[PDB]
Amino acid sequence: LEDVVIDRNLLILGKILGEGEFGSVMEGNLKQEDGTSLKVAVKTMKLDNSSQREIEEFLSEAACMKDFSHPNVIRLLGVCIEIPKPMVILPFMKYGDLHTYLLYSRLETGPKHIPLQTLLKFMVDIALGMEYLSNRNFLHRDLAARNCMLRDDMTVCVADFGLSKKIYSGDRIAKMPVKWIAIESLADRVYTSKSDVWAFGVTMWEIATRGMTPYPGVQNHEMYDYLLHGHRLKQPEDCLDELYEIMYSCWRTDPLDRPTFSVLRLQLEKLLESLP
Ligand SMILES: Cc1c(C(=O)Nc2ccc(Oc3ccnc4[nH]cc(-c5ccccc5)c34)c(F)c2)c(=O)n(-c2ccc(F)cc2)n1C
């Protein structure tokens, strides 16, 4: 019930880390039951109305995510209701998203050059997190490197995921940009765990290229026709053939032909095991 709700008095909101359509993300402090405070990320949201049905739906979503348990899945510590202003509390991650971390590594003052072993371990972590969610039949619908967060121990965790299990007709579906959206999802208002697998392949590619924008030289508006002619992301210069084969398998036309996250995870783990 209200075991997801944290008393607002236990929260201190700090500097705004970033803003968007959904609202703002702030750095904060959460006083725990044990009397000690913890650094957190607070995401301010907008409820459609001052409705009990609206507020109950927010709490049911929060309780669902709060019950998730995986080291490669971002944890929800709880929610606050400050007109009612809903807020989501997550443990703060100083390293931020994987995408900016990859670009920073290409600069001196930024993290040291990430070796291939570390890049593959970033993928394995995402695959592990995706395996968890998709075994519970949860659909992500926003998988990209920009929505993957780095923990202090450098393990990657999946964030910004949906809490639905099936996509209903079309009355959007994939929240991520066109270049991460599966061919079937571009063609129809359709989305499965296999469409999430397509995004995983695109994310693996962003990781292997260290933050490069997918499909260089191809416009967003020409993506569906580009893929429809059988064109896929090209192999990076600094990329093992075995790794390229794994990511290419994520983009097979028929979603049924693409591997499940559990298949992918083992493929990647075996590749990592074979390297020094
Ligand atoms: C999976 C998921 C959400 C999710 O993952 N949210 C999320 C992810 C990352 C966030 O951000 C962080 C978290 C930890 N360390 C960080 N370090 C830097 C950032 C940062 C700063 C600025 C811009 C972007 C990131 C940062 C954040 F606030 C929220 C989410 O909100 N919902 C959600 C919706 C409704 C509901 F009732 C219950 C949950 N669900 C389902």
Side-chain angles (χ1 to χ4, degrees), residues 4 16-19 24-27 40-45 57-66 68 73-76 78-79 86-97 133 140 146-147 149-150 157-163:
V4 71
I16 305 230
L17 303 176
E19 310 191 283
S24 332
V25 187
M26 280 146 112
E27 49 104 17
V40 298
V42 191
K43 187 221 205 174
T44 55
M45 289 184 179
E57 207 186 51
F58 172 72
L59 296 189
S60 174
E61 283 168 357
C64 175
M65 178 179 183
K66 197 181 186 156
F68 287 1
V73 177
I74 203 162
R75 30 190 215 116
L76 178 96
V79 291
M87 286 174 269
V88 314
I89 305 111
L90 305 102
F92 181 74
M93 284 154 199
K94 62 175 185 185
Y95 296 130
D97 71 305
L133 298 173
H140 193 308
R146 273 173 191 93
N147 303 333
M149 304 297 295
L150 282 139
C157 74
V158 304
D160 284 337
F161 51 81
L163 299 157

Short mmCIF file of all heavy atoms in Angstrom, two decimals, residues 4 16-19 24-27 40-45 55 57-66 68 73-76 78-79 86-97 133 140 146-147 149-150 157-163, ligand 1, unseen atoms left out:
data_model
loop_
_atom_site.label_atom_id
_atom_site.label_comp_id
_atom_site.label_asym_id
_atom_site.label_seq_id
_atom_site.Cartn_x
_atom_site.Cartn_y
_atom_site.Cartn_z
N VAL A 4 5.51 2.34 0.14
CA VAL A 4 6.34 2.91 -0.91
C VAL A 4 6.56 4.43 -0.64
O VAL A 4 7.61 4.96 -0.98
CB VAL A 4 5.79 2.58 -2.34
CG1 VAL A 4 4.50 3.33 -2.67
CG2 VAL A 4 6.84 2.81 -3.41
N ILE A 16 19.59 21.18 -9.22
CA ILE A 16 18.98 20.52 -10.35
C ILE A 16 20.08 19.96 -11.22
O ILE A 16 20.94 20.70 -11.71
CB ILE A 16 18.04 21.46 -11.13
CG1 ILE A 16 16.99 22.08 -10.21
CG2 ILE A 16 17.44 20.74 -12.33
CD1 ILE A 16 15.60 21.98 -10.68
N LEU A 17 20.04 18.65 -11.41
CA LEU A 17 20.99 17.94 -12.24
C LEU A 17 20.59 17.96 -13.72
O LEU A 17 21.45 17.74 -14.57
CB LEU A 17 21.14 16.50 -11.74
CG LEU A 17 21.57 16.28 -10.31
CD1 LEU A 17 21.55 14.80 -9.99
CD2 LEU A 17 22.90 16.97 -9.99
N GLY A 18 19.30 18.16 -14.02
CA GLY A 18 18.75 18.19 -15.37
C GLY A 18 17.23 18.25 -15.44
O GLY A 18 16.55 17.83 -14.50
N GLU A 19 16.69 18.82 -16.54
CA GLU A 19 15.24 18.98 -16.75
C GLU A 19 14.81 18.52 -18.14
O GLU A 19 15.58 18.59 -19.11
CB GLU A 19 14.81 20.44 -16.57
CG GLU A 19 15.28 21.10 -15.30
CD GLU A 19 14.65 22.44 -15.01
OE1 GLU A 19 15.06 23.44 -15.65
OE2 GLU A 19 13.75 22.49 -14.14
N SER A 24 11.96 17.63 -13.54
CA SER A 24 13.35 17.85 -13.18
C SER A 24 13.95 16.71 -12.38
O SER A 24 13.24 15.97 -11.71
CB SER A 24 13.48 19.15 -12.39
OG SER A 24 12.47 20.08 -12.71
N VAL A 25 15.26 16.57 -12.47
CA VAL A 25 16.05 15.63 -11.66
C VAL A 25 16.94 16.50 -10.78
O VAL A 25 17.63 17.40 -11.28
CB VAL A 25 16.87 14.58 -12.43
CG1 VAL A 25 17.49 13.57 -11.46
CG2 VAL A 25 16.00 13.86 -13.45
N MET A 26 16.88 16.25 -9.47
CA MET A 26 17.67 16.96 -8.48
C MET A 26 18.49 15.99 -7.70
O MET A 26 18.15 14.81 -7.63
CB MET A 26 16.76 17.72 -7.54
CG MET A 26 16.28 18.98 -8.10
SD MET A 26 14.63 19.25 -7.49
CE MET A 26 14.96 20.61 -6.48
N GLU A 27 19.58 16.48 -7.13
CA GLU A 27 20.38 15.72 -6.18
C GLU A 27 19.71 16.00 -4.82
O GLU A 27 19.11 17.06 -4.62
CB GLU A 27 21.86 16.16 -6.20
CG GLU A 27 22.12 17.66 -6.10
CD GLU A 27 22.59 18.18 -4.76
OE1 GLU A 27 23.04 17.37 -3.93
OE2 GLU A 27 22.57 19.41 -4.57
N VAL A 40 20.79 10.81 -2.83
CA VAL A 40 19.76 10.31 -3.74
C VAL A 40 19.54 11.21 -4.97
O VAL A 40 19.96 12.37 -4.97
CB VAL A 40 18.41 10.02 -3.03
CG1 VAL A 40 18.54 8.93 -1.96
CG2 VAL A 40 17.76 11.27 -2.47
N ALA A 41 18.84 10.67 -6.00
CA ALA A 41 18.39 11.43 -7.15
C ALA A 41 16.87 11.50 -7.02
O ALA A 41 16.21 10.51 -6.69
CB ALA A 41 18.80 10.75 -8.44
N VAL A 42 16.32 12.71 -7.15
CA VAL A 42 14.89 12.92 -7.01
C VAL A 42 14.32 13.35 -8.36
O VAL A 42 14.80 14.31 -8.95
CB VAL A 42 14.55 13.93 -5.90
CG1 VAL A 42 13.05 13.93 -5.61
CG2 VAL A 42 15.34 13.64 -4.62
N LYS A 43 13.32 12.62 -8.87
CA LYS A 43 12.73 12.99 -10.14
C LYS A 43 11.32 13.51 -9.92
O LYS A 43 10.45 12.75 -9.50
CB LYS A 43 12.79 11.82 -11.12
CG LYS A 43 12.34 12.16 -12.54
CD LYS A 43 11.50 11.03 -13.07
CE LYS A 43 11.51 10.94 -14.58
NZ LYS A 43 10.80 9.73 -15.05
N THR A 44 11.12 14.82 -10.15
CA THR A 44 9.81 15.47 -10.01
C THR A 44 8.98 15.17 -11.22
O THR A 44 9.48 15.17 -12.36
CB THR A 44 9.92 16.97 -9.72
OG1 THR A 44 10.70 17.60 -10.72
CG2 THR A 44 10.48 17.26 -8.33
N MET A 45 7.71 14.84 -10.98
CA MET A 45 6.76 14.45 -12.02
C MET A 45 5.51 15.30 -12.01
O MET A 45 5.33 16.15 -11.13
CB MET A 45 6.39 12.97 -11.87
CG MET A 45 7.50 12.04 -12.23
SD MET A 45 6.91 10.36 -12.11
CE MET A 45 8.36 9.51 -12.59
N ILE A 55 -3.45 9.42 -8.41
CA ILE A 55 -2.45 9.23 -7.35
C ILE A 55 -2.26 7.73 -7.01
O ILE A 55 -1.12 7.32 -6.78
CB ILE A 55 -2.69 10.14 -6.10
CG1 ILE A 55 -1.41 10.39 -5.33
CG2 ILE A 55 -3.79 9.67 -5.18
N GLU A 57 -2.69 5.18 -9.12
CA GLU A 57 -1.97 4.60 -10.25
C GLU A 57 -0.47 4.89 -10.13
O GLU A 57 0.33 4.02 -10.46
CB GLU A 57 -2.52 5.08 -11.60
CG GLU A 57 -2.28 4.06 -12.71
CD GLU A 57 -2.65 4.48 -14.11
OE1 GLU A 57 -2.21 5.57 -14.55
OE2 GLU A 57 -3.34 3.69 -14.81
N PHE A 58 -0.11 6.08 -9.62
CA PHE A 58 1.29 6.44 -9.39
C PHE A 58 1.90 5.54 -8.30
O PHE A 58 3.00 5.02 -8.48
CB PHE A 58 1.42 7.94 -9.02
CG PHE A 58 2.81 8.35 -8.57
CD1 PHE A 58 3.86 8.45 -9.49
CD2 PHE A 58 3.06 8.65 -7.24
CE1 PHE A 58 5.14 8.82 -9.09
CE2 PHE A 58 4.34 9.03 -6.84
CZ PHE A 58 5.37 9.12 -7.77
N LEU A 59 1.18 5.34 -7.17
CA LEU A 59 1.62 4.49 -6.06
C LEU A 59 1.74 3.01 -6.43
O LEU A 59 2.68 2.36 -5.96
CB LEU A 59 0.72 4.66 -4.83
CG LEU A 59 0.69 6.04 -4.16
CD1 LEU A 59 -0.07 5.99 -2.87
CD2 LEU A 59 2.10 6.60 -3.92
N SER A 60 0.82 2.49 -7.28
CA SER A 60 0.83 1.10 -7.75
C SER A 60 2.04 0.82 -8.64
O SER A 60 2.57 -0.30 -8.61
CB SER A 60 -0.45 0.77 -8.51
OG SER A 60 -0.37 -0.52 -9.08
N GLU A 61 2.46 1.83 -9.44
CA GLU A 61 3.62 1.78 -10.34
C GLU A 61 4.89 1.74 -9.49
O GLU A 61 5.80 0.94 -9.74
CB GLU A 61 3.65 3.00 -11.28
CG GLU A 61 2.68 2.95 -12.43
CD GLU A 61 2.47 4.22 -13.23
OE1 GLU A 61 3.07 5.26 -12.88
OE2 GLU A 61 1.70 4.18 -14.22
N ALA A 62 4.95 2.61 -8.48
CA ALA A 62 6.07 2.72 -7.55
C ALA A 62 6.28 1.43 -6.75
O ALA A 62 7.39 0.91 -6.76
CB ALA A 62 5.88 3.91 -6.65
N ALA A 63 5.21 0.86 -6.17
CA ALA A 63 5.26 -0.40 -5.42
C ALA A 63 5.75 -1.59 -6.27
O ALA A 63 6.40 -2.49 -5.74
CB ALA A 63 3.89 -0.71 -4.81
N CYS A 64 5.43 -1.58 -7.57
CA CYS A 64 5.82 -2.59 -8.56
C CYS A 64 7.35 -2.57 -8.78
O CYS A 64 8.00 -3.61 -8.70
CB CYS A 64 5.06 -2.35 -9.86
SG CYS A 64 5.56 -3.42 -11.23
N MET A 65 7.91 -1.37 -9.02
CA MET A 65 9.33 -1.18 -9.21
C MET A 65 10.08 -1.39 -7.90
O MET A 65 11.19 -1.93 -7.92
CB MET A 65 9.62 0.22 -9.80
CG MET A 65 11.11 0.48 -9.96
SD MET A 65 11.58 2.06 -10.65
CE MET A 65 13.32 1.86 -10.71
N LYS A 66 9.51 -0.94 -6.75
CA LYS A 66 10.15 -1.08 -5.43
C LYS A 66 10.40 -2.55 -5.09
O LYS A 66 11.42 -2.87 -4.47
CB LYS A 66 9.35 -0.38 -4.31
CG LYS A 66 10.16 -0.12 -3.03
CD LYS A 66 9.35 0.57 -1.92
CE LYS A 66 10.20 0.94 -0.73
NZ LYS A 66 9.63 2.07 0.08
N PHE A 68 11.14 -4.89 -7.31
CA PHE A 68 12.19 -5.45 -8.19
C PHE A 68 13.49 -5.60 -7.40
O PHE A 68 13.77 -4.78 -6.51
CB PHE A 68 12.47 -4.55 -9.39
CG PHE A 68 11.43 -4.50 -10.48
CD1 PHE A 68 10.26 -5.24 -10.38
CD2 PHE A 68 11.61 -3.71 -11.61
CE1 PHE A 68 9.29 -5.18 -11.38
CE2 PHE A 68 10.64 -3.67 -12.62
CZ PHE A 68 9.48 -4.39 -12.49
N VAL A 73 19.62 -3.47 -12.35
CA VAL A 73 18.35 -2.76 -12.48
C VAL A 73 18.37 -1.65 -11.40
O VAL A 73 18.63 -1.92 -10.22
CB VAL A 73 17.13 -3.72 -12.33
CG1 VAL A 73 15.82 -2.95 -12.39
CG2 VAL A 73 17.15 -4.82 -13.39
N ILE A 74 18.09 -0.42 -11.83
CA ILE A 74 18.06 0.71 -10.91
C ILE A 74 16.96 0.49 -9.85
O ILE A 74 15.87 -0.01 -10.17
CB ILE A 74 17.93 2.06 -11.68
CG1 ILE A 74 18.47 3.23 -10.85
CG2 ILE A 74 16.53 2.31 -12.21
CD1 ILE A 74 18.80 4.58 -11.73
N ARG A 75 17.27 0.78 -8.58
CA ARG A 75 16.33 0.64 -7.47
C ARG A 75 15.58 1.91 -7.17
O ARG A 75 16.12 3.00 -7.28
CB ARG A 75 16.96 0.06 -6.18
CG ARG A 75 18.41 0.37 -5.98
CD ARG A 75 18.98 -0.43 -4.83
NE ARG A 75 19.97 0.38 -4.13
CZ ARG A 75 19.86 0.79 -2.87
NH1 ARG A 75 18.80 0.45 -2.14
NH2 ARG A 75 20.80 1.55 -2.33
N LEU A 76 14.31 1.76 -6.82
CA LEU A 76 13.44 2.83 -6.38
C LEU A 76 13.40 2.67 -4.86
O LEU A 76 13.06 1.60 -4.36
CB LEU A 76 12.04 2.68 -6.99
CG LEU A 76 11.00 3.71 -6.58
CD1 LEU A 76 10.90 4.82 -7.61
CD2 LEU A 76 9.66 3.07 -6.44
N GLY A 78 11.69 4.74 -2.98
CA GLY A 78 10.34 5.17 -2.62
C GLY A 78 9.90 6.41 -3.37
O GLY A 78 10.53 6.82 -4.34
N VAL A 79 8.78 6.99 -2.93
CA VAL A 79 8.17 8.16 -3.57
C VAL A 79 7.66 9.17 -2.54
O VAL A 79 7.35 8.79 -1.42
CB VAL A 79 7.03 7.77 -4.58
CG1 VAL A 79 7.58 7.08 -5.84
CG2 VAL A 79 5.93 6.94 -3.92
N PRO A 86 4.10 14.65 -7.30
CA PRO A 86 4.75 13.35 -7.05
C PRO A 86 6.25 13.38 -7.35
O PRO A 86 6.69 14.11 -8.23
CB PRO A 86 4.00 12.41 -7.98
CG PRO A 86 3.61 13.25 -9.11
CD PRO A 86 3.33 14.61 -8.56
N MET A 87 7.04 12.58 -6.61
CA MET A 87 8.50 12.51 -6.71
C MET A 87 8.97 11.09 -6.56
O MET A 87 8.47 10.38 -5.69
CB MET A 87 9.14 13.29 -5.56
CG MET A 87 9.07 14.76 -5.70
SD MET A 87 9.70 15.54 -4.20
CE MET A 87 8.21 15.69 -3.27
N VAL A 88 10.00 10.68 -7.34
CA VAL A 88 10.58 9.33 -7.23
C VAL A 88 12.02 9.44 -6.68
O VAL A 88 12.78 10.30 -7.12
CB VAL A 88 10.45 8.45 -8.51
CG1 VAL A 88 9.04 8.52 -9.08
CG2 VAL A 88 11.46 8.83 -9.58
N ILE A 89 12.36 8.62 -5.70
CA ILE A 89 13.67 8.64 -5.02
C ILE A 89 14.50 7.41 -5.40
O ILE A 89 14.11 6.28 -5.15
CB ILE A 89 13.49 8.78 -3.48
CG1 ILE A 89 12.65 10.01 -3.13
CG2 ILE A 89 14.83 8.82 -2.77
CD1 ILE A 89 11.49 9.76 -2.64
N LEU A 90 15.66 7.65 -5.96
CA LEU A 90 16.56 6.60 -6.40
C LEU A 90 17.93 6.84 -5.84
O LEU A 90 18.29 8.00 -5.64
CB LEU A 90 16.64 6.63 -7.93
CG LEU A 90 15.33 6.53 -8.67
CD1 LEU A 90 14.91 7.90 -9.17
CD2 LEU A 90 15.44 5.57 -9.81
N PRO A 91 18.76 5.81 -5.60
CA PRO A 91 20.11 6.09 -5.06
C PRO A 91 20.93 6.89 -6.06
O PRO A 91 20.93 6.56 -7.22
CB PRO A 91 20.70 4.68 -4.82
CG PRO A 91 19.89 3.78 -5.68
CD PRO A 91 18.53 4.36 -5.75
N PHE A 92 21.56 7.97 -5.63
CA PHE A 92 22.34 8.83 -6.53
C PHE A 92 23.56 8.09 -7.08
O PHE A 92 24.22 7.38 -6.32
CB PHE A 92 22.76 10.12 -5.79
CG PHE A 92 23.55 11.07 -6.64
CD1 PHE A 92 22.92 11.82 -7.64
CD2 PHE A 92 24.91 11.21 -6.48
CE1 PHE A 92 23.67 12.65 -8.48
CE2 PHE A 92 25.65 12.08 -7.28
CZ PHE A 92 25.03 12.78 -8.28
N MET A 93 23.86 8.27 -8.37
CA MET A 93 25.00 7.70 -9.07
C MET A 93 25.86 8.81 -9.69
O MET A 93 25.52 9.35 -10.75
CB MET A 93 24.55 6.68 -10.11
CG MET A 93 24.13 5.38 -9.47
SD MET A 93 22.95 4.51 -10.49
CE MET A 93 22.26 3.42 -9.26
N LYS A 94 26.97 9.13 -9.00
CA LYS A 94 27.93 10.19 -9.33
C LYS A 94 28.51 10.06 -10.74
O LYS A 94 28.74 11.09 -11.38
CB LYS A 94 29.06 10.32 -8.28
CG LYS A 94 29.96 9.08 -8.10
CD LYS A 94 31.09 9.35 -7.14
CE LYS A 94 32.06 8.21 -7.02
NZ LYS A 94 33.09 8.46 -5.97
N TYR A 95 28.69 8.82 -11.23
CA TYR A 95 29.25 8.60 -12.57
C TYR A 95 28.25 8.91 -13.69
O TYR A 95 28.67 9.08 -14.82
CB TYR A 95 29.88 7.21 -12.73
CG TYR A 95 31.09 6.95 -11.85
CD1 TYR A 95 31.17 5.80 -11.07
CD2 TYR A 95 32.18 7.81 -11.85
CE1 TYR A 95 32.28 5.55 -10.27
CE2 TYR A 95 33.30 7.55 -11.07
CZ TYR A 95 33.35 6.42 -10.29
OH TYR A 95 34.44 6.14 -9.50
N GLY A 96 26.96 9.02 -13.34
CA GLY A 96 25.87 9.34 -14.25
C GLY A 96 25.63 8.27 -15.28
O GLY A 96 25.87 7.09 -15.02
N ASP A 97 25.13 8.67 -16.46
CA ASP A 97 24.83 7.77 -17.56
C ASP A 97 26.06 7.27 -18.28
O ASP A 97 27.08 7.95 -18.35
CB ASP A 97 23.86 8.40 -18.57
CG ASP A 97 24.45 9.51 -19.40
OD1 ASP A 97 24.98 10.46 -18.82
OD2 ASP A 97 24.32 9.46 -20.64
N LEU A 133 14.30 -8.28 -16.27
CA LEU A 133 13.05 -7.63 -16.64
C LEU A 133 12.23 -8.45 -17.62
O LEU A 133 11.06 -8.69 -17.35
CB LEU A 133 13.31 -6.23 -17.19
CG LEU A 133 13.97 -5.22 -16.22
CD1 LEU A 133 14.31 -3.94 -16.95
CD2 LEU A 133 13.09 -4.97 -14.97
N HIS A 140 10.82 -2.68 -21.71
CA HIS A 140 11.61 -1.46 -21.42
C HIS A 140 11.09 -0.26 -22.22
O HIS A 140 10.61 0.69 -21.62
CB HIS A 140 13.11 -1.69 -21.69
CG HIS A 140 14.02 -0.63 -21.16
ND1 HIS A 140 13.82 0.71 -21.44
CD2 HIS A 140 15.13 -0.75 -20.40
CE1 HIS A 140 14.78 1.36 -20.80
NE2 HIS A 140 15.60 0.53 -20.17
N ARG A 146 22.30 6.24 -23.12
CA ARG A 146 21.97 7.44 -22.36
C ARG A 146 21.10 7.15 -21.14
O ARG A 146 21.13 7.95 -20.21
CB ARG A 146 21.28 8.49 -23.26
CG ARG A 146 22.27 9.40 -23.97
CD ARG A 146 21.57 10.28 -24.97
NE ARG A 146 22.51 10.98 -25.85
CZ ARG A 146 22.91 10.54 -27.04
NH1 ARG A 146 22.47 9.38 -27.51
NH2 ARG A 146 23.76 11.25 -27.77
N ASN A 147 20.34 6.02 -21.16
CA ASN A 147 19.43 5.56 -20.09
C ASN A 147 19.99 4.41 -19.27
O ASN A 147 19.23 3.72 -18.56
CB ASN A 147 18.06 5.20 -20.66
CG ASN A 147 17.38 6.34 -21.39
OD1 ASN A 147 17.60 7.54 -21.16
ND2 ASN A 147 16.56 6.01 -22.35
N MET A 149 22.80 3.56 -16.28
CA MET A 149 23.51 4.30 -15.23
C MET A 149 24.65 3.52 -14.67
O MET A 149 24.56 2.30 -14.52
CB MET A 149 22.54 4.73 -14.12
CG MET A 149 21.35 5.58 -14.60
SD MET A 149 21.80 7.17 -15.33
CE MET A 149 22.48 7.96 -13.93
N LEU A 150 25.73 4.22 -14.34
CA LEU A 150 26.91 3.58 -13.77
C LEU A 150 26.92 3.72 -12.24
O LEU A 150 26.88 4.84 -11.73
CB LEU A 150 28.17 4.24 -14.32
CG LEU A 150 28.58 3.84 -15.70
CD1 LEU A 150 29.02 5.03 -16.43
CD2 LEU A 150 29.68 2.83 -15.64
N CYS A 157 23.66 -0.35 -14.70
CA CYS A 157 22.30 -0.74 -14.38
C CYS A 157 21.32 -0.07 -15.33
O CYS A 157 21.59 1.02 -15.83
CB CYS A 157 21.95 -0.52 -12.91
SG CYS A 157 21.68 1.21 -12.45
N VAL A 158 20.22 -0.78 -15.65
CA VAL A 158 19.19 -0.30 -16.55
C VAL A 158 18.20 0.60 -15.80
O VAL A 158 17.83 0.34 -14.65
CB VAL A 158 18.51 -1.45 -17.38
CG1 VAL A 158 19.54 -2.26 -18.17
CG2 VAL A 158 17.63 -2.36 -16.50
N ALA A 159 17.81 1.69 -16.45
CA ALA A 159 16.89 2.68 -15.93
C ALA A 159 15.98 3.10 -17.08
O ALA A 159 16.20 2.69 -18.23
CB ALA A 159 17.68 3.90 -15.43
N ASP A 160 15.01 3.97 -16.76
CA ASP A 160 14.01 4.62 -17.60
C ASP A 160 13.13 3.59 -18.35
O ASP A 160 12.60 3.85 -19.44
CB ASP A 160 14.62 5.72 -18.53
CG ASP A 160 14.99 7.06 -17.86
OD1 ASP A 160 14.42 7.38 -16.80
OD2 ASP A 160 15.84 7.79 -18.42
N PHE A 161 12.88 2.46 -17.71
CA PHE A 161 12.08 1.37 -18.28
C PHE A 161 10.56 1.46 -17.93
O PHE A 161 10.20 2.03 -16.89
CB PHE A 161 12.69 -0.01 -17.90
CG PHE A 161 12.99 -0.24 -16.44
CD1 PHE A 161 11.98 -0.62 -15.55
CD2 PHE A 161 14.29 -0.13 -15.95
CE1 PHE A 161 12.26 -0.86 -14.22
CE2 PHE A 161 14.56 -0.33 -14.60
CZ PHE A 161 13.55 -0.70 -13.74
N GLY A 162 9.72 0.97 -18.83
CA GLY A 162 8.28 0.91 -18.61
C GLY A 162 7.92 -0.23 -17.67
O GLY A 162 8.77 -1.09 -17.38
N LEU A 163 6.68 -0.23 -17.14
CA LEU A 163 6.24 -1.28 -16.22
C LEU A 163 5.08 -2.11 -16.81
O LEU A 163 4.38 -2.83 -16.09
CB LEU A 163 5.92 -0.71 -14.82
CG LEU A 163 7.07 -0.01 -14.05
CD1 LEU A 163 6.51 0.97 -13.01
CD2 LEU A 163 8.08 -1.04 -13.45
C1 LIG B 1 12.49 2.65 -14.17
C2 LIG B 1 11.81 3.91 -13.75
C3 LIG B 1 12.32 5.18 -13.54
C4 LIG B 1 13.72 5.60 -13.58
O1 LIG B 1 14.60 4.79 -13.85
N1 LIG B 1 13.94 6.90 -13.25
C5 LIG B 1 15.18 7.60 -13.16
C6 LIG B 1 16.39 7.20 -13.73
C7 LIG B 1 17.54 7.95 -13.54
C8 LIG B 1 17.48 9.11 -12.78
O2 LIG B 1 18.58 9.91 -12.56
C9 LIG B 1 19.61 9.47 -11.75
C10 LIG B 1 19.48 8.42 -10.85
C11 LIG B 1 20.60 8.05 -10.12
N2 LIG B 1 21.79 8.65 -10.23
C12 LIG B 1 21.86 9.69 -11.07
N3 LIG B 1 22.97 10.46 -11.32
C13 LIG B 1 22.68 11.38 -12.29
C14 LIG B 1 21.38 11.24 -12.69
C15 LIG B 1 20.70 12.12 -13.69
C16 LIG B 1 20.71 13.51 -13.53
C17 LIG B 1 20.10 14.32 -14.46
C18 LIG B 1 19.45 13.78 -15.54
C19 LIG B 1 19.40 12.40 -15.69
C20 LIG B 1 20.03 11.58 -14.78
C21 LIG B 1 20.82 10.16 -11.90
C22 LIG B 1 16.28 9.46 -12.19
F1 LIG B 1 16.24 10.59 -11.45
C23 LIG B 1 15.13 8.75 -12.38
C24 LIG B 1 11.25 6.02 -13.09
O3 LIG B 1 11.24 7.20 -12.79
N4 LIG B 1 10.12 5.21 -13.10
C25 LIG B 1 8.96 5.41 -12.29
C26 LIG B 1 7.91 6.18 -12.75
C27 LIG B 1 6.75 6.31 -12.00
C28 LIG B 1 6.67 5.62 -10.82
F2 LIG B 1 5.53 5.72 -10.08
C29 LIG B 1 7.69 4.82 -10.34
C30 LIG B 1 8.84 4.72 -11.09
N5 LIG B 1 10.48 3.91 -13.47
C31 LIG B 1 9.47 2.89 -13.79
#
